Amino acid sequence: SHMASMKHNINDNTLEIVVGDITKETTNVIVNAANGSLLGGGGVDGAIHHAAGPELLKACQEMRNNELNGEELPTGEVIITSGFQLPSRFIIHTVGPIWNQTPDLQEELLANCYRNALELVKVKKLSSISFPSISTGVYGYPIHEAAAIALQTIIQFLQENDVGLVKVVLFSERDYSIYQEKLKYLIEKI
Ligand SMILES: Nc1ncnc2c1ncn2[C@@H]1O[C@H](COP(=O)(O)OP(=O)(O)OC[C@H]2O[C@H](O)[C@H](O)[C@@H]2O)[C@@H](O)[C@H]1O
């Protein structure tokens, strides 16, 4: 029942980090750590598909067959679907880098997930979004490095743009603790 949280205001925006389950967030948008196929998986992708219900998979399949003409979603890029049975209005699906598959591009590619998702929130005039810890599960990205990239990217975006609320939802107290220390470090540098 205790779930740690902390927040920081950046101009008129708010950045919050929390322990929780992203499928229970009532932000306008939640972000899925997907794979290029968009057909689901385990971890957060599996949780989102289970919570959203079977209409999500159908929607992803139709997006693959029509708008993508069978192509997979590239690493760092985003697509948007409805939230279906989630408490959110939309799901932004992204694909994080698989750790050390492309060592010279992966920091940029991870940042892209966050920047592209936030640009889409801006475009659609949505005012709240939740992120998971993209790429730090099965994709193997070290949490200390990923948390730095995630937070630096979000902070920079919120310094330069009006968005609203950005939440990072950590699934463990271990990840939360690391995020908290990184966020505090980054705030002191502002
Ligand atoms: N309900 C949840 N809410 C928030 N975070 C969660 C939840 N469940 C897990 N996490 C955390 O979410 C974070 C990311 O872990 P992972 O979900 O493996 O994502 P990746 O980007 O590394 O792997 C993508 C692949 O895994 C899938 O099969 C896809 O289809 C791809 O094949 C971790 O901190 C988890 O503990």
Residue numbers in the entry: -4 to 185
Task: Quote the study that presented this structure, word for word.
Macrodomains are ubiquitous and evolutionarily conserved modules (approx. 130–190 residues) that recognize ADPr derivatives in their free form or linked to proteins, including ADPr, PAR, ADP-ribose-1″phosphate and O-acetyl-ADPr (OAADPr). To expand our knowledge concerning the field of macrodomains, we have characterized Oceanobacillus iheyensis macrodomain (OiMacroD), the first to be described from the order Bacillales. A yield of 40 mg of pure protein per litre of culture after a simple two-step purification process was obtained. The subunit has a mixed α/β fold, similar to that of other nucleotide-binding proteins, composed of a central seven-stranded mixed β-sheet (β1–β2–β7–β6–β3–β5–β4) and five α-helices.
Electron-density (ED) maps of native crystals soaked with ADPr (OiMacroD-ADPr) or ADP (OiMacroD-ADP) show a large mass of ED that matches an ADPr or ADP molecule bound to the enzyme and follows the same pattern found in other MacroD-like structures. The adenine moiety is stacked in a hydrophobic pocket with the highly conserved residues F166, I17 and V39. In addition, it is also strongly bound to residues D16 and I17 by main-chain interactions, which belong to the highly conserved sequence DIT in Block I. The pyrophosphate moiety of ADPr exhibits a rich network of contacts, which are decisive for ADPr binding. This pyrophosphate moiety is surrounded by helix α1 and the P-loop-like β6–α4, previously named as loop 2 or diphosphate-binding loop, with its positive dipoles oriented towards the phosphates, thus stabilizing the negative charges. Residues S130, G132, V133 and Y134, belonging to the P-loop-like motif (Block IV), and V39 (Block III) in helix α1, are directly involved in diphosphate binding. Finally, the distal ribose fitted in a cavity surrounded by the glycine-rich loop β3-α1 (Block III, G35–V39 in OiMacroD), also termed loop 1 or catalytic loop, and residues V133 and Y134 from the P-loop-like motif (Block IV). Residue G37 (loop β3–α1) anchors the distal ribose 1″-OH group, whereas the 2″-OH group is bound to residues N30 (loop β3–α1) and D40 (helix α1).
